[PDB]
A paper describes a structure:
Despite its essential role in mediating HIV-1 host entry, most antigenic surfaces on Env are either hypervariable or cloaked by an evolving glycan shield. Here, we present the cryo-EM structures of Envs from two Asia prevalent CRFs (CRF01_AE and CRF07_BC) at 3.0 and 3.5 Å. We also solve a 4.1 Å cryo-EM structure of CRF01_AE Env in complex with F6, the first bNAb from CRF01_AE-infected individuals.
Akin to other bNAbs, the epitope of F6 also involves N-glycans. Specifically, the conserved N88 glycan packs against the heavy chain framework region 1 (HFR1) of F6 and contributes ~350 Å2 buried epitope areas (close-up view 1). Of all the Env residues at this interface, R500 from gp120 plays a central role. The aliphatic part of R500 and the aromatic ring of Y619 from α8 helix form a hydrophobic cluster with the sidechains of Y49 and L50 from CDRL2, zipping α8 (gp41), the C-terminus of gp120 and CDRL2 together. Meanwhile, R500 also forms electrostatic interactions with E53 from CDRL2 and D30 from CDRL1, further strengthening the adhesion of F6.
Numbering used by the authors:
A (entry chain E): 1 to 82, 82A, 82B, 82C, 83 to 100, 100A, 100B, 100C, ...
B (entry chain X): 33 to 57, 73 to 116, 209 to 296, 330 to 353, 356 to 393, 409 to 424, 438 to 458, 464 to 503, ...
C (entry chain F): 1 to 27, 27A, 27B, 27C, 27D, 27E, 28 to 107
Write the structure that this text describes.
Amino acid sequence: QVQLQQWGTGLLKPSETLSLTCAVYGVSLRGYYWTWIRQSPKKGLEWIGEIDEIGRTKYSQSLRSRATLSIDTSKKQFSLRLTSVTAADMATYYCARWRLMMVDEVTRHGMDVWSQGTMVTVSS
Amino acid sequence: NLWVTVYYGVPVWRDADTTLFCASDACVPTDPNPQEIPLENVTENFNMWKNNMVEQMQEDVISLWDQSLSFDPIPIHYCAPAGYAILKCNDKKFNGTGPCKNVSTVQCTHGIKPVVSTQLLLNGSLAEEEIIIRSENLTNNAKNIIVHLNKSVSISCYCELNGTEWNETLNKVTEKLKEHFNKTIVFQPPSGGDLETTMHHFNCRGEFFYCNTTKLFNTEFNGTIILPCRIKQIVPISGIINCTSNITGIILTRDGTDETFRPGGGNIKDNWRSELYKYKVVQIEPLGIAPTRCKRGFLGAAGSTMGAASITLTVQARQLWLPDMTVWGIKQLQARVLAVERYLKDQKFLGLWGCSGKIICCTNVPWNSTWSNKSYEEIWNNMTWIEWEKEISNYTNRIYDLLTESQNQQ
Amino acid sequence: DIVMTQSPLSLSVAPGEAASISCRSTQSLLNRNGDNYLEWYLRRPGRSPQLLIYLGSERALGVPDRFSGSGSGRDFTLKISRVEAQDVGTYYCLQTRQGAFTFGQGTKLEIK
Ligand SMILES: *[C@@H]1O[C@H](CO)[C@@H](O[C@@H]2O[C@H](CO)[C@@H](O[C@@H]3O[C@H](CO[C@H]4O[C@H](CO)[C@@H](O)[C@H](O)[C@@H]4O)[C@@H](O)[C@H](O[C@H]4O[C@H](CO)[C@@H](O)[C@H](O)[C@@H]4O)[C@@H]3O)[C@H](O)[C@H]2NC(C)=O)[C@H](O)[C@H]1NC(C)=O
Ligand SMILES: *[C@@H]1O[C@H](CO)[C@@H](O[C@@H]2O[C@H](CO)[C@@H](O[C@@H]3O[C@H](CO[C@H]4O[C@H](CO)[C@@H](O)[C@H](O)[C@@H]4O)[C@@H](O)[C@H](O[C@H]4O[C@H](CO)[C@@H](O)[C@H](O)[C@@H]4O)[C@@H]3O)[C@H](O)[C@H]2NC(C)=O)[C@H](O)[C@H]1NC(C)=O
Ligand SMILES: *[C@@H]1O[C@H](CO)[C@@H](O[C@@H]2O[C@H](CO)[C@@H](O)[C@H](O)[C@H]2NC(C)=O)[C@H](O)[C@H]1NC(C)=O
Ligand SMILES: *[C@@H]1O[C@H](CO)[C@@H](O[C@@H]2O[C@H](CO)[C@@H](O)[C@H](O)[C@H]2NC(C)=O)[C@H](O)[C@H]1NC(C)=O
Ligand SMILES: *[C@@H]1O[C@H](CO)[C@@H](O[C@@H]2O[C@H](CO)[C@@H](O)[C@H](O)[C@H]2NC(C)=O)[C@H](O)[C@H]1NC(C)=O
Ligand SMILES: *[C@@H]1O[C@H](CO)[C@@H](O[C@@H]2O[C@H](CO)[C@@H](O)[C@H](O)[C@H]2NC(C)=O)[C@H](O)[C@H]1NC(C)=O
Ligand SMILES: *[C@@H]1O[C@H](CO)[C@@H](O[C@@H]2O[C@H](CO)[C@@H](O)[C@H](O)[C@H]2NC(C)=O)[C@H](O)[C@H]1NC(C)=O
Ligand SMILES: *[C@@H]1O[C@H](CO)[C@@H](O)[C@H](O)[C@H]1NC(C)=O
Ligand SMILES: *[C@@H]1O[C@H](CO)[C@@H](O)[C@H](O)[C@H]1NC(C)=O
Ligand SMILES: *[C@@H]1O[C@H](CO)[C@@H](O)[C@H](O)[C@H]1NC(C)=O
Ligand SMILES: *[C@@H]1O[C@H](CO)[C@@H](O)[C@H](O)[C@H]1NC(C)=O
Ligand SMILES: *[C@@H]1O[C@H](CO)[C@@H](O)[C@H](O)[C@H]1NC(C)=O
Ligand SMILES: *[C@@H]1O[C@H](CO)[C@@H](O)[C@H](O)[C@H]1NC(C)=O
C-alpha cells in the first residue's frame, strides 16, 4: 500500500513561479518513473513531464521553456517550478507513478497509484 | 503467447553454508570503514540454533588457543567472501527463531570478543529493549535456556559483587519467565558431581579462575557479595588480582509444586550462540527466467516490485574486496578461487545460450500453462524476485534443457 | 505529436448489456514486438482516476473482468459487459508511443 501526498500554494497571483512538492510513502524511488499530469477542465489530462530517480528528466516541447523538475532522495520527495504562469495555463493538478519493465527496451505498463491531487487557482 | 527470457544479476538469494574470512586489527586482514544496506518489504526466517557460524568460530578459537609457542580478547570479525552476503535480523523482539522483518544487509559483521566462560556471560553484547529468553524448545526439553539481560552488571575478582543489581536482575528474570512458566520460579545450585561444568570458569591475562557461584543462586544480598575462588595450580587465601569485567547474560537449565531452574551446564558453543544469534550467511543466485512478450547495492532491489527490480540492474558489478596488497592466506584464497569458478560457470551458461554476454536476451522458447498458470500482471508487477524463484525452482532444470535444445536446433 | 480521437463523445448506456468505446489515432501505434502502446483509464466524479487497461488488452489488479480491450494499428475498442454503479464516469485513451503524449477528449458514460 503506497500513498502519495502533495504540498503547494494553489492560490497565487499571475506571472510568477508555481512551486509544488510531492512525497511518496510506501516504497523507494529506485525502480519507477515519477511523472505528473496537467488536468484542465476543458483539455482533460495532458502529459507534462517525468523524472527518473537519478535526476534524468523528460519534458514536453510545449512546456519545456518555463518548467523545471527536481528530486530530493533524502526524504523521498520531488517538486517542480513553473516560471511566469498564465491564466490560460492552469497546470499541475495530480501526482503520479508509472510502472516499468526492461526487455531490450524500457517498456511502460500502466500507472497505478494516484495522489489526492491539488487545486491550483490564479488571481487577476 | 509468452516467451522465455533470461536475466542475469537479479537479487535472488538462498540459505547455504560457506567458510568466512577473519578480520582483525594466521588470518589478519585489516578492516576499513564499513557500511550497511537497508532492505524493504522482505521477510526472513531466522534460526540461530541451526546456524553455521558457531562451528567455524569454535574451530578458529581452537586454532588460536593452540598457537601458543597477553591474550586479551580483541574485536574479531568474520567477513563474508565474494558472492555471499550477511543478513542481520534487527527486530526489537527477535527472540531467536522465527520470521522477522526489517532485515538488513552488511558487507560483514561487527566486533566480537572471543571470551570463554560458563554459567555466566562476560563482556558480551547487551540487549536492546527487554530481557530476552532464547531456547530451541522452551516448553519441554533438556536443552539450555539463555537469558539475555538489558541491565548490565559489574563483577570483579575472590569475586566482589554489588548485590543490588543482582537482586534487581533476579526479580526481572523471574518476572520475565513468569508468563512462559506457570509454576513459581525458584533457583537452586547446580548440584553437580564435579566442578567441570557447575562452577565459574574463566581466564584473566593467562591465569585460570574457577570461581564459586552458589551464593548468587539460592532458595538476601546483605551488602557486598564475596565469592570464594580458586586458581588452577600446576604440578590459599587469594583471588583478588584486580580483574574487572561485565556480566551480561545468564545460562539456566530447567528440571523435570514450583518450577526449579539450575544454572550452569551446557557446552562452550552455547556461550557463543548468544552473540551470533542475529546473523545469517546467505548465497546470491544471480540468474533467473521470466515470461515476456519479446521474441527473438546489488541487493536493494530485492523485496521490491518485479519490474522495479528488473529495471534497476546495471553493469557496475565488475565480478559476480576492500583490503589490497596484503597476504591472502589459505581461507581467503580458497574462497576467491571458488567464487571465480562460480562466475565462470555462470558465464558458460550464458554463452551456451543466445545472451552471449549481454544481461537481458530473448530466446525462442514458448511458455507453458504448467510452469505457472498465473496472469502476466501477477508475474511482472506484484511479486518479489525471491518468491518467483522459489515458486519456479521445481522446473528450472527442464527450462534450462529446453532452452539449450532450442538454441542448438536453430 | 499525434492528434488523438475518441468516440462517441457522450454515451447513454442502459444497464444489462455491453457498452463499446472506439478510439483512433493518426500515426500507427503497433509495435514490432509489443502488442500496443495504448492504455485506458477511468475517472469518477471527484475521485483520482485509476487504471483499467495497460499495454494492449490485458487488465490489471482490481478489474472485475467486466472491462476488456482490443484493436490494433488504427482502431481500438473497449467493451464493458455490465454497468451498474461504479464504472459510470469518464473513459480516457492514452497514447504512449513516442515523444509528447496526448490523452484526447474523454468519453462520458452514465445510466438512463
Ligand atoms: C514496504 O516497506 C515500506 C517501508 O518500510 C512500508 O512503508 C511504511 O509503512 C507505511 C506505508 O505502507 C507508512 O506509513 C504511512 O505514512 C504516511 C505518511 O506519514 C507521514 O504522516 C504521519 C502522520 O502521523 C507521520 O506520523 C509520519 O511521520 C509522516 O510524516 C501516512 O499518511 C499513512 O497514514 C495512512 O493511515 C492513516 C491511518 O493511520 C490514514 O489516516 C492516512 O490517510 C493514510 O491512509 C501511513 O501511516 C510508513 O511511514 C512507511 N515507512 C517509512 C519508513 O516510511 C510499506 O508499508 C511496506 N509494504 C508492505 C506491503 O508492507
Ligand atoms: C572485559 O572488558 C574489560 C575492559 O574494561 C577488561 O578489563 C581489562 O583487562 C585487561 C587485562 O588485564 C587490562 O589490561 C591491562 O592494561 C594495563 C595497562 O593499563 C594502561 O592504562 C591504564 C589506564 O588507567 C593506565 O593507568 C596504565 O598505566 C596503563 O597505561 C597493563 O599494564 C596490564 O598488564 C600488562 O602489562 C604488564 C606490565 O606492566 C605485563 O606484565 C602484562 O603481561 C600485561 O601485558 C593489562 O594488560 C585492562 O586495563 C582492563 N580494562 C580496564 C578498563 O581496566 C576485561 O579483561 C574483559 N574481560 C575479559 C574476560 O577479558
Ligand atoms: C499484490 O501484492 C500486495 C503486496 O505486495 C498485496 O497487498 C496486500 O496483500 C495482502 C495479502 O495478500 C492483503 O491482505 C491486503 O489486502 C493487500 N493490500 C492491498 C492494498 O492490495 C496485494 O493483495 C497483491 N495483489 C494481488 C492481486 O496479488
Ligand atoms: C519466538 O517467536 C516466534 C513468533 O514470534 C515463535 O514462533 C511461534 O511460537 C508459537 C508458540 O510457541 C507456536 O505456536 C508457533 O507455531 C510458532 N510459529 C513458528 C512459525 O515457529 C517462537 O516459538 C518464539 N520462540 C521463543 C524461544 O520464544
Ligand atoms: C519440544 O519438546 C517436547 C518434549 O520432548 C516435544 O514433545 C514430544 O514429542 C515427541 C515426538 O517427537 C513425543 O513422542 C513426546 O511424547 C512429546 N513429549 C511431550 C512432553 O510433549 C515437542 O515435540 C518439542 N517441540 C519442538 C518444536 O521441538
Ligand atoms: C551498589 O550499587 C547500587 C546501585 O547503583 C548503589 O546504590 C545506589 O546509590 C546511589 C547513591 O550512591 C543512589 O542514587 C541509587 O539510587 C542507588 N541504587 C540503588 C539500586 O539502590 C550502591 O551504592 C552500590 N554499592 C557499592 C558498595 O558499590
Ligand atoms: C562452593 O560453595 C559452596 C558453599 O555452600 C560449597 O558447598 C558447601 O561445602 C561445605 C564444605 O566444604 C559444606 O559444609 C556445605 O554444606 C556446602 N554447601 C552447599 C550449599 O553445598 C561448595 O563446596 C563450593 N564449591 C567448591 C568447588 O568448593
Ligand atoms: C528498522 O531498523 C532500522 C535499523 O537502524 C531502524 O533504524 C528502524 O527504526 C527500524 N524500523 C522498524 C519499523 O523496525
Ligand atoms: C560493562 O560495564 C563497564 C562499566 O560501565 C563498561 O566499561 C563495559 O563496557 C561494560 N561491558 C560491555 C560489554 O559493554
Ligand atoms: C529491561 O527489560 C525489562 C523487562 O520487563 C524492563 O522492565 C526494563 O525496563 C528494561 N530496562 C531497560 C533499561 O530497558
Ligand atoms: C531483594 O530481594 C527480596 C526477595 O524477595 C525482595 O523482597 C526485596 O524487595 C529486594 N530488594 C529490593 C528490590 O530493593
Ligand atoms: C582492584 O581490585 C578491586 C576489587 O576489590 C577493584 O574494585 C579495583 O578496581 C581493582 N583496581 C583497579 C585499579 O582496577
Ligand atoms: C507443457 O508441458 C507439458 C508437460 O510439461 C507438455 O505435455 C505440454 O506439451 C507443454 N505445452 C506446450 C505448449 O509446450
